[PDB]
Amino acid sequence: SSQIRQNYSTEVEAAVNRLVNLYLRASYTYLSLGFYFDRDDVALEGVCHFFRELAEEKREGAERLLKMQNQRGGRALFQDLQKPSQDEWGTTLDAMKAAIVLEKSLNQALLDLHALGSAQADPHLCDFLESHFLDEEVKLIKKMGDHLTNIQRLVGSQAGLGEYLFEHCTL
């Protein structure tokens, strides 16, 4: 009955709504991460800012998906947004570990949506994922792995601290 809908499976429509939920959950998680690091007894405002920026990116992804849902003539359906998995997020290392786990769950969701879009022969969907999501996730996951390595190095030892300072201050 939708007058623009063409080659748009009910399966993809549903999976897109689920991915919106996944992205909004991710944004909520990053909001909680950021405010934790803003606590006076944590007080790492740069970490708060890093996570605040990610909450925004994740919300923007959801909005992009919702725009696409309408462009294809699907019906956006919203579900409860579950609260984040933790109320306190431990150290910078713990938080960046939780963040890469999250990004990896979104990345797997995008890959699963491509597999569905391929099975449904929906190239507009594939193009959309490619254009806005797949490379963005890979780039973000690389940066977070980079961060994990640096944090481990900085917290580990004077040899690690040493090499980090040399790179940052001499190079």
Residues 60-99 that bind Au ion (CB under 5 A): none
| Residue 76 to residue 49: CA distance in whole angstroms | 30
CB of 156 to its own copies, least distance (A): 8
In this structure, how many other beta carbons lie within 10 angstroms of the beta carbon of residue 128? 20
Considering the rule CB under 8 A, would residue 4 count as an interface residue with its own copies?
Answer: yes
Which CB sits closer to its own copies, 11 or 121?
121
Q: Which residue has the tokens 């990345």?
A: 107
Draw the binding track, 71-100, toward its own copies (x: CB under 8 A; -: no contact).
Answer: xxx-xxxxxxxxxx--x---xxx------x
The reply to whether 90 sits near Cl ion by the rule CB under 5 A is no
Cβ distance to its own copies smaller for residue 18 or 124: 124
- 110-129 binders of Cl ion (CB under 5 A): 118, 121, 123
Q: Considering beta carbons, is residue 19 or 72 the nearer one to its own copies? A: 72
| Long-range contacts (CB closer than 8 Å, 24 or more residues apart) made by 151-158 | 151/92, 151/93, 151/96, 152/93, 155/91, 155/93
The answer to whether the CB of 103 falls within 8 A of the CB of 144 is: yes
Question: Is 126 among the residues that bind Au ion (CB under 5 A)?
Answer: yes
Determine the 3-state secondary structure of 154 from DSSP. helix
Window 97-116: residues binding its own copies (CB under 8 A): 100, 104, 107-108, 111, 114-115
Was 136 annotated as part of a binding site?
A: no
User: Burial, 81: exposed, middle or buried (Cβ in 10 Å; 0-12, 13-18, 19+)?
Assistant: exposed
Q: Which residues are annotated as a binding site for Fe cation?
A: 53, 56-57, 60, 63
